[PDB]
């Protein structure tokens, strides 16, 4: 946190910074709050923010979601490899389904998510004005959650074109349903580490 205060005082002076990648370094709740201040500034021109493997938890998602409320420049956010839990995803979803949201690309790989966040995610898929890519690999969503996701993906207003999803432990019936969706929505690619396609 010593350290983090140096970085944030410098960012206050930086101009035109489009990307900020903190991945792999732990941020305390307190550093998260100073970062959220950074994002709220009107001069903030960040387009990409990467916080993967940073020790974030659910309460951090609430702060990030509120920090995105004003922001119109961020188009890509990586929260992979943090124990966000379903409660953390729910805070993000509240923001991402708003009509002012500009976020295009969101990565939630290995974030401790279950089927219990998938109704919230599906409401994002159906209503977000901006979300094009969503990576949910390394989360245990199961047939129940993926079915809920598919209910949102089927919405003709769904903007998504790339979904990252673990398919190995899904049922044969679920995998047939996903392939049927891909046939109906040819602009959508469902990929994984095992089906990189």
Curated annotation (Swiss-Prot):
Phosphorylated by MAP3K20 isoform ZAKalpha, MAPK11 and MAPK14 in response to UV-B irradiation and ribosome collisions, promoting activation of the NLRP1 inflammasome and pyroptosis. LRR repeats lie at residues 16-37, 45-65, 73-94, 102-122, 130-151, 157-180. It is found in: Cytoplasm, Cytosol; Cytoplasm; Nucleus. Widely expressed. Abundantly expressed in primary immune cells (isoform 1 and isoform 2), including in neutrophils, monocytes/macrophages, dendritic cells (mostly Langerhans cells), and B- and T-lymphocytes (at protein level). Strongly expressed in epithelial cells lining the glandular epithelium, such as that of the gastrointestinal tract (stomach, small intestine, colon), the respiratory tract (trachea and bronchi), and the endometrial and endocervical glands, gallbladder, prostate, and breast (at protein level). It comes from the Eukaryota. Induction: Up-regulated by ATF4 during endoplasmic reticulum (ER) stress response. Up-regulated in arterial endothelial cells exposed to plasma from patients with peripheral arterial disease, but not to plasma from healthy controls. In macrophages and dendritic cells, NLRP1 inflammasome activation of CASP1 and IL1B maturation can be dampened by direct contact with activated effector and memory T-cells. This effect may be mediated by hexameric TNF ligands, such as CD40LG. Interacts (via LRR repeats) with BCL2 and BCL2L1 (via the loop between motifs BH4 and BH3); these interactions reduce NLRP1 inflammasome-induced CASP1 activation and IL1B release, possibly by impairing NLRP1 interaction with PYCARD. Interacts with NOD2; this interaction is enhanced in the presence of muramyl dipeptide (MDP) and increases IL1B release. Interacts with EIF2AK2/PKR; this interaction requires EIF2AK2 activity, is accompanied by EIF2AK2 autophosphorylation and promotes inflammasome assembly in response to danger-associated signals. (Microbial infection) Interacts with vaccinia virus protein F1. Belongs to the NLRP family. The CARD domain, rather than the pyrin domain, is involved in the interaction with PYCARD, CASP1 and CASP5. It is linked to Vitiligo-associated multiple autoimmune disease 1: A disorder characterized by the association of vitiligo with several autoimmune and autoinflammatory diseases including autoimmune thyroid disease, rheumatoid arthritis and systemic lupus erythematosus. Palmoplantar carcinoma, multiple self-healing: An autosomal dominant disease characterized by keratopathy with neovascularization, bilateral corneal opacification, palmoplantar hyperkeratosis, dyshidrosis, dystrophic nails, and recurrent keratoacanthomas in palmoplantar skin as well as in conjunctival and corneal epithelia. In addition, patients experience a high susceptibility to malignant squamous cell carcinoma. This is NACHT, LRR and PYD domains-containing protein 1. It comes from Homo sapiens. The gene is NLRP1.
